[PDB]
């Protein structure tokens, strides 16, 4: 009757029921096996277990642990029977065919779902913003994508992929905080820095001008108190860390910044739809939550685009769960009813039916 929606990210799992405005469960995507627990229960016993990320840069790389993530999602987080709910899942652009088949095989043979479907994460974000055509900047914990879309179709030749994302920004913030005598190295210390990054970091409109104001400013430096009661302070690192997204050389990468990969992706599309892409820049993902990233993107793209082009960045406040919200909307529509891969279809075709039904 009611369908499940599950967005499996490199860092967080967002799952819930179709028709809801927000995911019911948001837990970390980790599995711990003894030297088996998952999610938050695995981090509590991080000494008894060796923790593994089953998703790396948006790609499932450990199917044994990934199967445990879904089992927990169904019975422990949502507390439902998978054999009673159609399940909508998400995937990265250009996901390897074998991965799409293994996901379909597991959902049907292991969890016995009556129906399933897999959609592209960036497409579900575009849908949530009331659009079916545009270019999506999807930036999460493990990977960043620039996905131009036409009529729900991701344009594969123009999709840009960057290994830089939220987790890499946390690692860079750990590095530049050594300039203040802070030594964050271990995994438990990295979660402190990610919290500081989420709370105090922001994107500067003009990075070089923001650097000249840092010493003169009276409001740049903020305080943060660690779990043990010690108080640390952070200054210009608040925007030098998310500056890596625009100047990836800050971490030794040769790639271009997300503003250039957006422009490079638009130029690889047909000239007839570039104007529609320039005017529908949708941002989704936790790493797009930095204050000011929308204005900075608006400025950087205008400097690259022709002077005559109209440019609009769409950064909704709920864009941390845009992928899931779009999936919740999609799986609840009546006109979506005939698009599911039913259980009766899978038992005849097998996993390879995913390539014809999910597009």
């Amino acid at each position: 009757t009611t369908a499940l929606v599950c967005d499996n990210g490199s860092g967080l799992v967002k799952a819930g029921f179709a028709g809801d405005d927000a995911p019911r469960a948001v837990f970390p995507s980790i599995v711990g096996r003894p030297r088996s627990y998952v999610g938050d229960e695995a981090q509590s016993k991080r000494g008894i277990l060796t923790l593994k990320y089953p998703i790396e840069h948006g790609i499932i790389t450990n199917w044994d642990d990934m199967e445990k993530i879904w089992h927990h999602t169904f019975y422990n987080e949502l507390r439902v029977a998978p054999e009673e709910h159609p399940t909508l899942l998400t995937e990265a652009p250009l996901n390897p065919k074998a991965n799409r088949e293994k996901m379909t095989q597991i959902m049907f043979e292991t969890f016995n779902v009556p129906a399933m479907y897999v959609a592209i994460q960036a497409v579900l974000s575009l849908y949530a913003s009331g659009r079916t055509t545009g270019i999506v900047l999807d930036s999460g914990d493990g990977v960043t994508h620039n996905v131009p879309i036409y009529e729900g179709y991701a344009l594969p030749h123009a999709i840009m992929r960057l290994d830089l994302a939220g987790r890499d920004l946390t690692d860079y913030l750990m590095k530049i905080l050594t300039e203040r005598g802070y030594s964050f190295v271990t995994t438990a210390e990295r979660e402190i820095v990610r919290d500081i990054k989420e709370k105090l970091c922001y994107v500067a409109l003009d990075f070089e001008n923001e650097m000249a104001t840092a010493a003169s400013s009276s409001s740049l430096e903020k305080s943060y108190e660690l779990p043990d009661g010690q108080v640390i302070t952070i200054g210009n690192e608040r925007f030098r860390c998310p500056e890596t997204l625009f100047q990836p050389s800050f971490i030794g990468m040769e790639s271009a910044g997300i503003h250039e990969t957006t422009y490079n992706s638009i130029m690889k599309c047909d000239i007839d739809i570039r104007k529609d892409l320039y005017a529908n820049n949708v941002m989704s993902g936790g790493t797009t939550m930095y204050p000011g990233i929308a204005d900075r993107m608006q400025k950087e793209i205008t400097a690259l685009a022709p002077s005559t082009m109209k440019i609009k960045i769409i950064a909704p406040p709920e864009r941390k769960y845009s992928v899931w919200i779009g999936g919740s909307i999609l799986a609840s529509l009546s006109t979506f009813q005939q698009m599911w891969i039913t259980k009766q279809e899978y038992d005849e075709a097998g996993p390879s039916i995913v390539h014809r039904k999910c597009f």
Binding site: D21, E56, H57, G58, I59, I60, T61, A92, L94, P96, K97, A98, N99, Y127, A128, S129, G130, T132, Y150, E151, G152, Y153, L155, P156, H157, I159, M160, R161, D163, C269, D270, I273, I329, L330, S332, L333, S334, T335, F336, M339, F359
Partner: protein
């Protein structure tokens, strides 16, 4: 939220088909997942350039690695390799971004897996299974003649791939690979039915075994 659900409701039933969007020229084939003959044409060749790169890299750095083409590489790094290849960027397979040799072999095995049609073509699958079921004294002849009937991209790519795998087996003392373990790897991927696995592995074994006479 009400206006977006209504428009999505109608968009799902009026959304254009995938072929219509490809008629407009908005969806273009890349290196992975694209037709083999179209890819070789666009590159003015008969062997995909990425296929030749992997083979030359593996024959120079991985011929002694134990369990090559059997040990799996990291899927996320391979996915990064797919984008680097699909964009025709400056690429050196010996750089440290690609980690180890198994990423290269894994990307090579994936290229053939992602092909829309198998390397041995769909319309010749039945003939290949029937040729391997024949009496053993007539098998090699039947397999060779079916290969000579394939299009030139499939013929050329088959020879470069099999001659490479032959040298891999000839160093089996160092890499512990044999005709059977290699055929178990490439059997299901090189031969698919449009719609058995034991005959597919047998076809690759025979070609690797009588490489000289089959490609004469």
């Amino acid at each position: 939220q009400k206006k977006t659900k209504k428009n999505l409701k109608k968009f799902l039933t009026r959304r254009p088909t995938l072929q219509a969007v490809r008629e407009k020229g908005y969806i273009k084939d890349q290196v992975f997942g694209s037709n083999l003959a179209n890819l070789c044409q666009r590159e003015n060749g008969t062997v995909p350039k990425f296929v030749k790169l992997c083979i030359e890299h593996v024959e120079e750095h991985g011929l002694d690695v134990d369990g090559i083409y059997r040990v799996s590489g990291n899927l996320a790094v391979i996915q990064k390799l797919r984008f680097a290849v699909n964009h025709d960027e400056k690429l050196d397979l010996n750089d440290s971004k690609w980690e180890d040799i198994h990423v290269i072999t894994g990307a090579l095995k994936m290229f053939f897996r992602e092909l829309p049609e198998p390397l041995f073509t769909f319309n010749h699958f039945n003939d290949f299974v029937n040729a391997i079921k024949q009496e053993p004294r007539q098998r090699v002849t039947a397999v060779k003649d079916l290969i000579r009937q394939l299009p030139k991209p499939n013929q050329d790519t088959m020879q470069i791939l099999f001659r490479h795998l032959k040298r891999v087996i000839e160093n089996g003392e160092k890499n512990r690979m044999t005709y059977q373990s290699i055929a178990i790897v490439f059997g299901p991927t090189l031969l698919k039915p449009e719609r058995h696995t034991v005959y597919q592995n047998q076809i690759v074994e025979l070609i690797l075994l009588e490489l000289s006479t089959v490609f004469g």
